[PDB]
Design a protein around this ligand. Sequence first.
Ligand code: 402
Ligand code: SF4
Ligand code: SF4
Ligand code: SF4
Ligand code: SF4
Ligand code: FES
Ligand SMILES: [Cl-]
Ligand SMILES: [Cl-]
Ligand SMILES: [Mg+2]
Ligand SMILES: [Mg+2]
Length: 580
Amino acid sequence: KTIIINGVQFNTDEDTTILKFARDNNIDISALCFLNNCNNDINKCEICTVEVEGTGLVTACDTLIEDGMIINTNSDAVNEKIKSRISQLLDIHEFKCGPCNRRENCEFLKLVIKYKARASKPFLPKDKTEYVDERSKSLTVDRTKCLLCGRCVNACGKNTETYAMKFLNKNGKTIIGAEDEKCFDDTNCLLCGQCIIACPVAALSEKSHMDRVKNALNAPEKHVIVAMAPSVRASIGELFNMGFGVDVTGKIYTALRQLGFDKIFDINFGADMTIMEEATELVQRIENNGPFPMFTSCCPGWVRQAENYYPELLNNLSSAKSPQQIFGTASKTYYPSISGLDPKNVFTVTVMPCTTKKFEADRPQMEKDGLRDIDAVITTRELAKMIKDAKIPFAKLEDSEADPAMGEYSGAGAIFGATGGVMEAALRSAKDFAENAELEDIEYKQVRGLNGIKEAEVEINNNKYNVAVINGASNLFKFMKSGMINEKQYHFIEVMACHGGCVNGGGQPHVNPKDLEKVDIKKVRASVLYNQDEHLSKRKSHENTALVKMYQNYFGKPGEGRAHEILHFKYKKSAWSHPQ
Ligand code: 402
Ligand code: SF4
Ligand code: SF4
Ligand code: SF4
Ligand code: SF4
Ligand code: FES
Ligand SMILES: [Cl-]
Ligand SMILES: [Cl-]
Ligand SMILES: [Mg+2]
Ligand SMILES: [Mg+2]
């Protein structure tokens, strides 16, 4: 194939699009609706317009290169077309970046600047309430910003296969939203937030908990605990121009103290408690020859997927609470017992890479004696904004430590945030538990990485067991619908709704599509966690000294008695009824 682009000749055997070939050869072509290898088929943005001699204007993102093509990417006709499309988008866009939560990393703003585009008539809605949906516990929609690019719809389809995000006809007007314009929570939506991650603008956002947090911090009698997820320390530095794959654990602890939090703990401590309980439950099932398989229960997007599509599996979920909720439960029971705090005055905040965790924390029954396990959940993005609003020089902060009593963590907890991390961590303990041993070989590399469905055979007390790691909600559907769950007897299955694990959660920093082709974000974020595991002295959850003290002095033996009564949560399918 001989191709000429802007007067430059190329000879290639590639079968690809103009857009992909140009970018591979360092020729600039803009794009908007193209992402995840698809564009908006029914309302093409045409920001990728180029001129093909003899054909006319074409969309580079979905036109294959062909021998004999002469292409111009930067002619007057091309730039006029692109400018006109951006101007038409501005006609339906509330262009007020000052107070906008994407002001610092908005893809639309970059295009507006690049093409010097302007609205024909500014869009200045007086009553935004009709454009905004804040009913959800996890997601919010601001349609004054929506470009109808379809990236959320395509991303939902690709990442979850639920198609919970849809194009809708709202009284003759095209919008995106949930089925029948319902609250997302009331549909089959997983609340995973992958649609947010795909959005180029501030149209999709997380449900804010920042007022909950600030009110608690400012309340004189509230003792505000904060604890961050495994993935936050591998990610948040991106929002302070520190690059990708930077471990910023110690700076986070310092920043949270400067924000006024009263105690600095860590969800990785909760990850070690989840393993304590779940590895014990696994050994119990092994000893009772069932029931099998046991599924993890720590990802609430997967729990929603089971509730909404596979309710027959709810009884197979581990009853261990997730790290967030198990930590929260202990923060209202154990922590008062070692601090003197009145439990009613403890206010527990988590920082998580996840929108779904807000829904999980707000589940009616996630409480005891009138005290919520978790009172507020802020995303990685929300914490970044609080740090910047406080004018805290994050990149320059010195490292501090967490408060140890609920802040120490093992290497097993540290890797929870990557796909296969829970599996690996759980096996390190279940194997020791079952064989009553302190095994030296603890690295389960077979369950790691970005393969969508991963299986391994493991030997526990000279018996072979089958495990699987399901990496992304679409892969859960593939595993079940294809009958793979029936090709062998599985005994323990990890499921995460977000491909890559929580490092790719719906509350994480947005990454520019061009940056995404330069950096493998899922692997680079995950690398921070595996590195911590490698360099930590304790690499099994049951070797966490602060956790052992907790169980010895307060909860007793895991998996039974007090621990089971307090630290577990069972999901139940609805009983048969007619009509459905
Ligand atoms: N609860 C909890 Fe988890 C832990 O520990 C997080 O905090 Fe995850 C992360 N990072 C998130 O969100 S949830 C699913 N299990 C894997 S990791
Ligand atoms: S979405 Fe982007 S272009 Fe629109 S107001 Fe916010 S920052 Fe500005
Ligand atoms: S939250 Fe997840 S399941 Fe729901 S619409 Fe967004 S991508 Fe789809
Ligand atoms: S919500 Fe965001 S991703 Fe979805 S169509 Fe609107 S601008 Fe595009
Ligand atoms: S994989 Fe992690 S970030 Fe994604 S929905 Fe599950 S818990 Fe949340
Ligand atoms: S980027 Fe090609 S049509 Fe939208
Ligand atoms: Cl509930
Ligand atoms: Cl402490
Ligand atoms: Mg297409
Ligand atoms: Mg205070």
